[PDB]
Each structure stands twice: as C-alpha cells, then as structure tokens.
Amino acid sequence: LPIMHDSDRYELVKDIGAGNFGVARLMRDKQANELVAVKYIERGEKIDENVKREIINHRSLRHPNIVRFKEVILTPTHLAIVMEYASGGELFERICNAGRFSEDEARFFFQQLISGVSYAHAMQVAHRDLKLENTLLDGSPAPRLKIADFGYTPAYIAPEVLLKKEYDGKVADVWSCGVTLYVMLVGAYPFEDPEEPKNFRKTIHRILNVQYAIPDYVHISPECRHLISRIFVADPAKRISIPEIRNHEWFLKNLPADLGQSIEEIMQIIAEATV
Numbered sequence: 001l002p003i004m005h006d007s008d009r010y011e012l013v014k015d016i017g018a019g020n021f022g023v024a025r026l027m028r029d030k031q032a033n034e035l036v037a038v039k040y041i042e043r044g045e046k047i048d049e050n051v052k053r054e055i056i057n058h059r060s061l062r063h064p065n066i067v068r069f070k071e072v073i074l075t076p077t078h079l080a081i082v083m084e085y086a087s088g089g090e091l092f093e094r095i096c097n098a099g100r101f102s103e104d105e106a107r108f109f110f111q112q113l114i115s116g117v118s119y120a121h122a123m124q125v126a127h128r129d130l131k132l133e134n135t136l137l138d139g140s141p142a143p144r145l146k147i148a149d150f151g152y153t154p155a156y157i158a159p160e161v162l163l164k165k166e167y168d169g170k171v172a173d174v175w176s177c178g179v180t181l182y183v184m185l186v187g188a189y190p191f192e193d194p195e196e197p198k199n200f201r202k203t204i205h206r207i208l209n210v211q212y213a214i215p216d217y218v219h220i221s222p223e224c225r226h227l228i229s230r231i232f233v234a235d236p237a238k239r240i241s242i243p244e245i246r247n248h249e250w251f252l253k254n255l256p257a258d259l260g261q262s263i264e265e266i267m268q269i270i271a272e273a274t275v
C-alpha cells in the first residue's frame with residue numbers, strides 16, 4: 001500500500017486487504033472522530049475518466065443510508081479516495097447471528113433499505129448495481145443500514161433478468177429488496193429448497209416459477225404476507241413498485257419521520273493524478 005499521509009488529520013487505524021471494501025486502509029479522522037475507509041489508485045494512466053465518472057457519481061450521493069463520499073487526496077504515489085466506513089459488519093451477518101429478525105426489526109431495516117434504494121433511483125442515470133445482496137451497517141444501538149454504491153447466489157436475481165433481453169433495472173431491484181426482506185424474516189434464502197439447497201437447477205427453477213414457502217414456525221401479520229406476495233411476481237409489469245411499497249400498510253407502521261468537497265477541487269485533484 002501507500003505510505004501513510006496527512007498523518008496530521010488522519011490516524012492510521014489498520015491496513016485491510018479483503019472484504020466489502022476491497023483492499024483498503026481504515027483511518028480515524030481526528031476532527032469529528034470517526035472511522036473512514038481509504039481506497040488508493042495508482043497515479044499512472046490508471047486515472048482515466050471511468051475513475052473520474054465513478055468518483056463524481058459517488059460524490060453526488062447524499063443520503064443517511066448510503067455510503068457517502070468524503071474527499072479525494074493526492075499523494076505522489078496514488079490518488080486517495082476517502083469515504084465513510086460502515087463498522088457494523090454486514091446485514092446478513094447480523095441476520096444469521098440472530099437466526100432471524102422479529103417482524104418489527106425487519107421493518108426497521110426494510111424501511112431504510114427502501115428509502116435508500118428510492119433515492120438512488122431518483123439519482124440514477126444508468127441504473128448502477130447497488131449489489132443489494134451485501135448491504136452493511138454502521139455502528140450503534142439501532143444500527144443504520146448502509147448501501148454501498150461503489151465502482152472503482154442466484155437468489156437475488158429476478159425472473160426477467162435472466163428471462164428477457166430488455167429489462168427494467170428498477171423493477172429488478174424491488175425483487176432484490178423482496179429477497180432481503182424474506183431473509184430477514186425467515187433466516188434463509190427465498191428459493192433454496194432444503195433437501196439440497198447447494199443445488200443450482202433446483203434453485204433457478206424455483207425462481208422462475210416463484211415457488212417459495214414461508215415455513216410453519218415463522219409468524220407474520222397478513223399485511224406483511226401481502227407485501228411479500230406483491231413483490232414476488234414473475235411478470236415485471238405487475239410487480240409492485242417503490243412508490244406503491246412506500247404506501248403499503250406494512251411499510252407505514254412505525255415509519256420514522258426522517259424517512260463537502262468542491263466539484264472543482266475534486267476535478268483539479270484527479271487531473272494531477274493522471275501524472
């Protein structure tokens with residue numbers, strides 16, 4: 001990695017090399033006292049527009065449930081991209097430590113998930129890949145959901161995505177959100193037959209036929225059971241939409257009231273990096 005820099009504003013926490021944050025460096029920003037992750041791109045021709053595009057796109061996302069961008073810093077060795085770090089670990093990690101969430105707990109996360117996805121949708125020009133199978137959490141009493149919109153199993157894929165040539169990515173996202181909700185409530189993926197889940201034909205098969213089964217021991221209000229059924233619809237034109245979900249009885253219950261660097265300075269830093 002690159003030798004520590006602005007020691008004076010950031011305290012080196014540790015140098016990671018694997019995870020949802022690729023290869024990176026954790027740092028504590030001395031003022032505001034908070035963890036931050038740093039990514040590094042080599043100064044060479046590796047600094048093309050693609051990188052510029054992603055940096056800007058990520059720099060525009062300003063939402064409490066999204067991994068916010070922080071600042072670019074130039075070191076002779078590399079361009080440093082600094083962003084907020086979700087300490088909390090992964091959502092999926094918390095789900096399987098608990099076995100499964102209570103209905104109320106799942107709603108608490110789903111509300112954040114849908115708010116953050118809705119925001120990304122209103123800010124998407126090409127429909128990036130949220131990778132909703134791997135959302136993170138910050139760290140605190142009521143952990144906050146964090147979606148990773150960076151760039152630098154079959155269960156989450158809607159039937160159309162494989163099925164049809166042209167497919168709306170925003171409808172595909174709702175399906176993915178459905179799968180995450182099922183997982184939170186049930187503790188297992190939506191279409192992974194027990195007998196032999198590791199299988200593939202069987203799982204893809206279930207997806208295409210929408211065969212899912214909330215097990216006996218899992219109890220949930222019928223309003224919740226309705227929402228799920230409106231999400232797991234094979235035909236996209238008929239799948240419930242984000243605006244409708246925000247208006248669903250189940251979603252409304254307990255809905256909380258809630259739910260930088262100059263563009264130039266940034267552009268000036270990327271250019272230099274090109275050398």
Ligand SMILES: [Cl-]
Nearest residue numbers: 100101102103
């Ligand atoms: Cl429970």
